From a paper:
Functional tau is most abundant in neuronal axons where it binds to microtubules, assists microtubule assembly, and is essential for the structural integrity of neurons and for axonal transport. Here, we identify a new amyloidogenic segment, PAM4 (Polymorphic AMyloid segment in repeat 4), encompassing residues 350–362 of R4, and show that it self-assembles into amyloid fibrils. Cryo-EM revealed that PAM4 fibrils are highly polymorphic, and, remarkably, that the polymorphs formed by this segment in isolation recapitulate the conformations that PAM4 adopts in polymorphs from different human tauopathies. In all cases, the folds share a C-terminal β-strand (residues 358–362) but differ in the way they orientate the N-terminus about an intermediary GS-bend (residues 355–356).
Two-dimensional (2D) classification revealed that this peptide batch also formed multiple fibril polymorphs, with three distinct PAM4 fibril structures that could be determined to high resolution. The remaining two PAM4 fibril structures were determined at resolutions of 2.7 Å (Type 3, 15% of the total population) and 2.9 Å (Type 4, 13% of the total population), respectively. The Type 3 and Type 4 fibrils share similar structural properties including crossovers around 80 nm and containing eight PAM4 subunits per layer of the fibril core, differing only in a slight re-positioning of the inter-protofilament interface. The resolution of the maps, in combination with liquid chromatography-mass spectrometry (LCMS) data, facilitated the identification of an adduct coming from a minor population of the peptide containing an N-terminal Fmoc protection group from peptide synthesis (~7.4%). Specifically, the FoldC conformation of PAM4 stabilised by the K353-D358 salt-bridge is also found in tau C-fold protofilament polymorphs linked to Alzheimer’s disease (AD), Gerstmann-Sträussler-Scheinker (GSS), primary age-related tauopathy (PART) and cerebral amyloid angiopathy (CAA), while showing reasonable fit to chronic traumatic encephalopathy (CTE) polymorphs. Finally, FoldD PAM4 matches R2:R3:R4 (4R) tau strains that are associated with corticobasal degeneration (CBD) and argyrophilic grain disease (AGD).
Residue numbers in the entry:
A (entry chain E), B (entry chain M), C (entry chain U), D (entry chain X), E (entry chain P), F (entry chain H), ...: 350 to 362
The structure:
């Protein structure tokens, strides 16, 4: 509700 | 509800 | 409801 | 489910 | 569930 | 569940 | 979503 | 979401 | 979310 | 019962 | 019962 | 019962 | 399941 | 389950 | 479960 | 929900 | 929810 | 919730 | 209910 | 209910 | 309920 | 519901 | 519910 | 609920 997700997994290999 | 998802998985190999 | 999805998986190999 | 979601309700008497 | 989520309610008498 | 979440309620008499 | 309400009831008596 | 309400009830008596 | 309310009830008597 | 009701599932292999 | 109700699941393998 | 109700699960292997 | 009802109402008038 | 009812109401009038 | 009811109400009038 | 599941009702009026 | 599940009701009026 | 689960009710009026 | 089991497995080796 | 089990497994080795 | 178990496992070795 | 009610189960290895 | 009610279980290894 | 009610269990190794 009225929320936001920028990212969950940023995986740099 | 009135929410936003920018990204979930950003995987750079 | 009144929501938006920009992206889910951005996979650069 | 059986809710009121993302709505506007105006009443005048 | 059986809630009022993200709504506006205005009443005038 | 059976709550009032993220809402605005205005009443005038 | 990205909308506007100018007014709902304009009443002159 | 990114919206505006100018007014709902404009009443003149 | 990133919204504005100018007013809800403007009443002149 | 044993469902997926209004949910989001993302699986990356 | 044994469901996924309004949830988010992200699985990266 | 034995559900996932409005939750977020992130699993990275 | 594997049960028996002899009688429910015996009404002598 | 594996139960028995002899009678519920015996009413002599 | 494996139980018995002989009677509930015996009413002599 | 609001049901009668495997029950017994006896009503003498 | 608001049910009768495996119960017995006897009502003599 | 607000149920009768495996109970016995006898009411003589 | 009013039944009988003589045997299930008679194994001779 | 009013039953009998003579035997289940008779094993001779 | 009013039952009998003669035996379950008769094992001869 | 999802039960084993008034049943017999025999397993031999 | 999710129970083992009035049942017999025999296992032999 | 999730119980073992009025049952017999026999295990032999």
């Amino acid at each position: 509700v009225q929320s936001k997700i920028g990212s969950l997994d940023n995986i740099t290999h």
